[PDB]
């Protein structure tokens, strides 16, 4: 009755530690990951302090080693001051994150020349990922070509963006991309229900035509990733709502529903939540690690999932078919039927495993 | 000084056992694989008897389990009589092999309708690979679309073929392909040296323009695979030369030379000899497995490599930079500097590992 999947990987999560632990911490965010059938996460650097230098990375690594329940890697963040300074720690990170649209004064880059400087100084064998919306996708692709290296585009959300990436791939350019579940399963049609606070997300929800273009161009999508961006309901419904949705606990149930409906195959799903994340980010295998899912159980997403401290979900009310029943991580039962069974600190930094270093020429 | 690589995978080898063991056997062919930095091979079914039914597969599995020194999976072969009969053993094979051009009376398919029948009856979640040259590439792609599933094209050798596959990928069709080293590093210019016997291979050596098109379209190539096709020198130089080159021991040195010359990156190589083979064929990770290579040592390929019983090589005289120094397979030293150190039978059938079954819906 159950289907055994390999350990799934989410390459785009915000776990809020250090500095935003009321929204989520490593322990709660990785519990959410396990309950969503995810056994490895890559955590983004827009924490407080942001992970933009070696001291901040060192702090975040110890906090994750002590709090994470699943395995992880941590991104470094590009700033207006750190190009050329990250070489000694670069290989210990998941990759480098560029925030190319509206952002915090610390990750903010004010000039494309600063993007160039990062592409030129970051080690050429290590991953670079970009938050790049609309024409910014084209712009960062140009910078990647000028510096003759690859780039990965986060959360593609629009017909415009997926078709641009499609055209770049047709020209043989080294670009990969990911799509988040809210851009496949929500649209403008849902903003009346969500309201302008809860509905705030970046990239914003697309039109029906945007959603249909992403599905029609599934072949262009290399990865799914949640962009798990937990904020409390008070923050989402308050005066200055921060953008973002929680998504770790809902991503796999949503996608399994789509598999059961024949919208994509099980293999299509596993390429995008396992094999392609591995190969783009050079993430190591996890020994004795698997996820058991039940594809027959129909349920309705409630007003909040059990684990994320966000304590809300934009998918409330959607019917899904597909449940995570059991997760085994490195030989230990990590999750069964609504209970996480590995403690904070069980998770490890995969970049410290010998098989987790990115291969490079001498 | 040494570069650590993961365990490399060759998805296209002919190991000649059962029935052609003077050309190669599991023990000698997997020694050649290890000396070439390969830790897992997928063996083709055109043996004697050919692996076209459950009894033949059972025999080949035991012979491989007893003789293989590295890990393996075995292909089943499509015949004019076995469509609809392989369902119980299909999941235990690497995949199904279709020989669509000139071949033996046992793997010979006389009608595209027989290709259709195989695409319709072989389990939809399991791999299908095709020897398909020139217009046969287009024909098998059509059959794949009619049956709405994927196909993998073996040894792409011509500008015509890579551009057709390129066009299919631009239309979002589920097709992958592999290229063999002789089609990247040899051409018509080498036939005078090789002669018409040694030079006989299928697909035949291409023109300079074919070779240049493959390099220019590297982005379209998903895998490298040797098409290791050992025949003795007596056979290659005799009256009716069989097509094929040995290649396990020369593939990685040739490609490392190209990396050192900047023709492709180390990552490009590892996508094509590790990550993409894994994800196309759902091959499991190998624990505690790695290859150490030396990228500074310049040497000239001799008249025969140490291990393959073929006892000849078409790459004789080429200068290479790159050597396999050490291979560790599942925690045991398997190869050092010209000596294989694991015995016949150390290798295992990866499809019997829990992590080596192809995931499928209930
Ligand atoms: Zn973002
Ligand atoms: Zn991302
Ligand atoms: Zn994000
Ligand atoms: Zn890798
Ligand atoms: Zn062939
Ligand atoms: Zn092949
Ligand atoms: Zn072959
Ligand atoms: Zn797989």
Topology, please?
The structure is a homodimer of 362-residue chains.
Chain A: E1 2-6, E2 8-13, H1 26-35, E3 38-43, H2 54-67, E4 71-74, E5 76-77, E6 96-99, H3 112-121, E7 128-131, H4 135-146, E8 151-153, H5 159-170, E9 175-179, H6 182-185, H7 191-198, H8 208-216, E10 223-224, H9 233-236, H10 248-260, H11 266-281, E11 290-300, E12 319-329, E13 332-336, E14 339-340
Parallel strand pairs in A: 2-3, 3-4, 5-6, 6-7, 7-8, 8-9, 9-10
Antiparallel strand pairs in A: 1-11, 11-12, 12-13, 13-14
Helix pairs in contact in A: 1-2, 3-4, 4-5, 5-8
The structure holds zinc ion (8 copies).
Concise summary:
The structure is a homodimer of 362-residue chains. Chain A is 31% helix and 19% strand.
Features:
362 residues, TIM Barrel, de novo pyrimidine biosynthesis, binds zinc ion, CAD, homodimer, alpha/beta, TIM-barrel, Multifunctional protein CAD (chains A, B), globular, biosynthetic protein, 5-stranded antiparallel sheet
Polypeptide structure, described:
Chains A, B: Homohexamer. Interacts with CIPC. Chains A, B: This is Multifunctional protein CAD. Chains A, B: In the N-terminal section; belongs to the CarA family. Two copies of one chain form a homodimer. By secondary structure, the first copy, chain A, is an alpha/beta fold. In chain A, the strands form three sheets. A six-stranded parallel sheet of chain A has the order 5-6-7-8-9-10. The first copy, chain A, has a five-stranded antiparallel sheet with strand order 1-11-12-13-14, with helices on one face. The first copy, chain A, contains eleven helices and 14 strands. The first copy, chain A, has a single domain, classed as Alpha-Beta Barrel (TIM Barrel), CATH 3.20.20.140. Chains A and B meet through strand 1 and helix 11 of A and strand 1 and helix 11 of B. The structure holds zinc ion (8 copies). The site of one zinc ion (ZN) has 5 residues of chain A, from loops. The site of one zinc ion (ZN) has 2 residues of chain A, from loops.
């Amino acid at each position: 009755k159950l289907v055994r999947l390999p350990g799934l990987i989410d390459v785009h999560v915000h776990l809020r530690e250090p500095g935003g632990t009321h929204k989520e911490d490593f322990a709660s965010g990785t519990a959410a990951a396990l309950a969503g059938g995810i056994t490895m996460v890559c955590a983004m650097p827009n924490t407080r302090p942001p992970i933009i230098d070696a001291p901040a990375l060192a702090l975040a690594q110890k906090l994750a080693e002590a709090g994470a329940r699943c395995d992880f890697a941590l991104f470094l963040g590009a700033s207006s001051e750190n190009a050329g300074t990250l070489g000694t720690v670069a290989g210990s990170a998941a990759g480098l994150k560029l925030y190319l649209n509206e952002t915090t004064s610390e990750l903010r880059l004010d000039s494309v020349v600063q993007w160039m400087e990062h592409f030129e100084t970051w080690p050429s064998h290590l991953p670079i990922v970009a938050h790049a919306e609309q024409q910014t996708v084209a712009a960062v692709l140009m910078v990647a070509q000028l510096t003759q290296r690859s780039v990965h585009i986060c959360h593609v959300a629009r017909k415009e963006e997926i078709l641009l990436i499609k055209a770049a791939k047709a020209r043989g350019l080294p670009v990969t991309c990911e799509v988040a579940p809210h851009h496949l399963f929500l649209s403008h049609d849902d903003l009346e229900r969500l309201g302008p606070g809860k509905g705030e997300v970046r990239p914003e929800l697309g039109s029906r035509q945007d959603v249909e273009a992403l599905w029609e161009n599934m072949a262009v999508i290399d990865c799914f990733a949640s962009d798990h961006a937990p904020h409390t309901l008070e923050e989402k419904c308050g005066s200055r709502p921060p953008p973002g949705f929680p998504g770790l606990e809902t991503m796999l149930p949503l996608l399994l529903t789509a598999v059961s409906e024949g919208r994509l195959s099980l293999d299509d799903l596993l390429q995008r939540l396992h094999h392609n994340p591995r190969r783009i980010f050079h993430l190591p295998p996890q020994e004795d690690t698997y996820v058991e899912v039940d594809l027959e159980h129909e349920w309705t997403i409630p007003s909040h999932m059990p684990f994320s401290k966000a304590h809300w979900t934009p998918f409330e009310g959607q019917k899904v078919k597909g449940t995570v029943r059991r997760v085994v991580l490195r030989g230990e039962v990590a999750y069964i039927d609504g209970q996480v069974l590995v403690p904070p600190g069980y998770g490890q930094d995969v970049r410290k495993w010998p098989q987790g270093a990115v291969p490079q020429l001498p």
